[PDB]
């Protein structure tokens, strides 16, 4: 199917408690494969998936060089943004950045991404054209001017269409037994009375990969969006994910309700009912 690679950088200032922390993690789809943390006793790029371990010393050395350089650059950037917003030196602030490439089911580039935030709000993003920027406010417009002057977009584009795709394809091959395996949800419906005249039906999905899934309840074939309690998809810790969706129904009407499950790992969507 379709696949993506993303890197997630977080740089966080903490006045009075040392220099800002820089952390980078890398993902292919929902599988993390590297980390770097400037607060580690000996900061270095570390493997987080078995299939990346085969990369040679030069790979790890280059990654670590890059992340050490970024640690310093992002510290300067934090300083710069504090000034752009006329902020005091007292507060803690965060730059986040997420970038990477999406491939279609043929392995071809679908599109690239390179987006940044400041204190959790959109700051600047590379447009889908990989050539122009969208700045969120007059501060980010300063960054935009700087990056336009230095032709930064051209360099980001070169990476996103080149090395990004090339490495993602390599990772997909090296990790093909896991990265290219969809594990379907294991499903069941539970029933608990909430009183004499109502009961909760809960539709479960467990053990699935990747995390993308759709779980819905219908009553008489009609979507029950407003009446359904849906929890956030959550990681099990063994690579797989879990989710449930619950509806409270009048006692005696249980068979009018159906749970529908869509997942990459399923040929055809499932329809489930409570089975007393």
């Amino acid at each position: 199917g379709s696949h993506s690679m993303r890197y997630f950088y977080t740089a966080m200032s903490r006045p009075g408690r040392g220099e800002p922390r820089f952390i980078a993690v890398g993902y292919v789809d929902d599988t993390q494969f590297v980390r770097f943390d400037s607060d580690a006793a000996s900061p270095r790029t570390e493997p987080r998936a078995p299939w990346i371990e085969q990369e040679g010393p030069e790979y790890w050395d280059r990654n670590t060089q890059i992340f050490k350089t970024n640690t310093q650059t992002y510290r300067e950037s934090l300083r710069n943004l504090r000034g752009y917003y006329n902020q005091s030196e007292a507060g803690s602030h965060i730059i986040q950045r997420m970038y990477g490439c999406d491939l279609g089911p043929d392995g071809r580039l679908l599109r690239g991404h390179d987006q940044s935030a400041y204190d959790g709000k959109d700051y600047i993003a590379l447009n889908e054209d990989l050539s122009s920027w969208t700045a969120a406010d007059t501060a980010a417009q300063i960054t935009q001017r700087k990056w336009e002057a230095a032709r930064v977009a051209e360099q980001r584009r070169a990476y996103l269409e080149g090395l990004c795709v090339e490495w993602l394809r390599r990772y997909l091959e090296n990790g093909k037994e896991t990265l290219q395996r969809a594990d379907p949800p294991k499903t069941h419906v539970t029933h608990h009375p909430v009183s004499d005249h109502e009961a909760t039906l809960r539709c479960w999905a467990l053990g699935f990969y990747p995390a993308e899934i759709t779980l819905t309840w219908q009553r008489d074939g009609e979507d029950q969006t407003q009446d359904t309690e849906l929890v956030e998809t959550r990681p099990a810790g063994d690579r797989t994910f879990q989710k449930w969706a619950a509806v409270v129904v009048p006692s005696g009407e249980e068979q009018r309700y159906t749970c529908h499950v869509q997942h990459e790992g399923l040929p055809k969507p499932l329809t489930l009912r409570w089975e007393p």
């Binding site: 890197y7 980078a24 890398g26 790979y59 280059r62 990654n63 890059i66 992340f67 350089t69 970024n70 650059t73 300067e76 950037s77 710069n80 943004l81 730059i95 970038y99 940044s116 600047i124 960054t143 700087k146 990056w147 230095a150 930064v152 360099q155 980001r156 070169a158 990476y159 090395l163 990004c164 490495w167």
Partner: peptide
């Protein structure tokens, strides 16, 4: 693999 030189310029 992360991007390298394209990340040289500060914000």
């Amino acid at each position: 693999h992360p991007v390298g030189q394209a990340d040289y310029f500060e914000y």
